[PDB]
Amino acid sequence: KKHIYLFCSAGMSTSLLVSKMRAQAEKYEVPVIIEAFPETLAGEKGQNADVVLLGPQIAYMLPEIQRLLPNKPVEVIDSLLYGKVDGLGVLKAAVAAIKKAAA
Amino acid sequence: AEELEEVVMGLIINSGQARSLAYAALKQAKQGDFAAAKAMMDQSRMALNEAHLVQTKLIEGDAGEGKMKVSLVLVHAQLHLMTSMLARELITELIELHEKLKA
Amino acid sequence: AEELEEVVMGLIINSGQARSLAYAALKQAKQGDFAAAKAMMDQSRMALNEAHLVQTKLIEGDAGEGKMKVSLVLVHAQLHLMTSMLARELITELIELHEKLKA
Amino acid sequence: AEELEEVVMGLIINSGQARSLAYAALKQAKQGDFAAAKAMMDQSRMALNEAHLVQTKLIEGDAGEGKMKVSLVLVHAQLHLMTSMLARELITELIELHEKLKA
Numbered sequence: 001k002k003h004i005y006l007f008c009s010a011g012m013s014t015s016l017l018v019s020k021m022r023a024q025a026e027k028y029e030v031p032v033i034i035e036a037f038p039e040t041l042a043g044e045k046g047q048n049a050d051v052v053l054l055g056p057q058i059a060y061m062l063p064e065i066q067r068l069l070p071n072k073p074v075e076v077i078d079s080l081l082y083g084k085v086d087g088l089g090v091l092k093a094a095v096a097a098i099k100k101a102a103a
Numbered sequence: 104a105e106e107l108e109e110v111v112m113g114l115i116i117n118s119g120q121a122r123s124l125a126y127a128a129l130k131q132a133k134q135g136d137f138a139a140a141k142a143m144m145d146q147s148r149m150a151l152n153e154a155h156l157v158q159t160k161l162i163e164g165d166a167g168e169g170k171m172k173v174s175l176v177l178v179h180a181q182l183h184l185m186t187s188m189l190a191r192e193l194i195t196e197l198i199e200l201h202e203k204l205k206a
Numbered sequence: 207a208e209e210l211e212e213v214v215m216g217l218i219i220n221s222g223q224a225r226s227l228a229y230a231a232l233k234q235a236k237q238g239d240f241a242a243a244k245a246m247m248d249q250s251r252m253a254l255n256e257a258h259l260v261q262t263k264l265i266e267g268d269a270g271e272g273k274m275k276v277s278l279v280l281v282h283a284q285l286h287l288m289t290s291m292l293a294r295e296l297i298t299e300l301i302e303l304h305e306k307l308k309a
Numbered sequence: 310a311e312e313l314e315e316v317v318m319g320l321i322i323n324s325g326q327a328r329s330l331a332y333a334a335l336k337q338a339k340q341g342d343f344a345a346a347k348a349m350m351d352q353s354r355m356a357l358n359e360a361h362l363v364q365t366k367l368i369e370g371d372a373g374e375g376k377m378k379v380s381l382v383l384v385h386a387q388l389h390l391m392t393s394m395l396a397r398e399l400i401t402e403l404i405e406l407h408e409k410l411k412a
């Protein structure tokens with residue numbers, strides 16, 4: 001089971017996206033664990049993720065998070081997919097980042 | 104909701120950035136850099152002011168969904184904004200004390 | 207609800223204990239006991255960290271009762287936790303000042 | 310609601326006045342007026358105590374509208390009261406520091 005960790009300031013507004021992603025992962029039997037955390041834990045929690053996703057509001061922090069976790073694929077969630085709360089779409093992008101990372 | 108929810112995320116992030124700047128301002132004071140501290144507080148204040156202004160609108164037109172009831176998120180923004188504003192004010196006082204400490 | 211409600215009580219108590227320890231830490235500083243103050247601060251931080259971690263889970267899975275709506279108590283725990291964490295951080299700064307005051 | 314709503318307004322105003330007095334108390338300290346500062350803090354505390362007492366009643370009998378659910382405004386008063394009380398306590402510490410600073 002791969003760990004997909006999302007970051008935002010407190011971990012709420014993204015919490016709704018996480019619940020929809022979990023529903024989708026169950027529907028299609030994707031072996032993943034999805035958790036939302038505030039951006040303050042990106043360095044502490046990110047070390048255990050298989051893929052690190054940043055909320056659209058914290059995109060400006062991408063370079064810093066990449067330097068903090070040089071051994072993890074880190075990327076920003078598409079703002080439209082995020083605004084629309086597209087659990088399936090974001091789940092797809094996360095699995096993709098993992099595949100493109102393992103090869 | 105769509106905007107209100109995305110707006111709250113922005114407010115939470117803004118409030119978080121405000122605090123971050125405030126703590127950074129304090130750090131400058133510890134380094135004996137009163138000039139940089141002062142500049143950082145000013146920007147932090149401006150950030151909050153803009154955030155507070157947005158919240159003001161969010162409280163004036165909090166109606167729509169129901170009569171007595173209001174948007175629940177109003178609190179996620181108020182809580183973060185109130186905490187950040189208070190923190191900054193106290194931090195400002197703390198910085199002034201550093202100045203009095205001579206250092 | 208059952209757990210969520212009992213959990214909030216625990217969080218409120220934990221947050222309260224955290225503040226209590228923080229104030230106690232400050233009191234130690236006033237007595238000129240930097241060692242005890244430092245130790246008390248560390249424990250307070252750890253208590254908050256555990257409390258924050260529990261809240262994080264409570265925000266990631268805040269869904270269930272309804273789509274847009276979330277557990278009401280989430281705020282109660284957030285309010286107490288946010289206040290306690292902020293107070294503790296400021297108290298830490300205050301303690302550092304006591305150290306600079308020489309005493 | 311009628312009273313609860315009007316009561317919250319009173320609490321918010323009271324909390325605001327409390328903070329106002331607290332900051333004013335601090336200002337007195339900056340002027341080197343420990344006597345006036347002390348008097349102002351005492352009054353601020355009494356104002357908060359009365360406000361807290363009213364809130365206590367508002368939390369003990371928060372039932373009526375529904376089983377699990379409680380008055381929404383309870384938070385509004387709690388948020389303001391918690392922030393004001395915390396601020397005042399920290400301000401008290403800050404004032405004590407001014408006294409230690411000799412000035």
Ligand SMILES: O=[P-]([O-])[O-]
Nearest residue numbers: 009010011012013
């Ligand atoms: O918890 P969040 O949506 O900043």
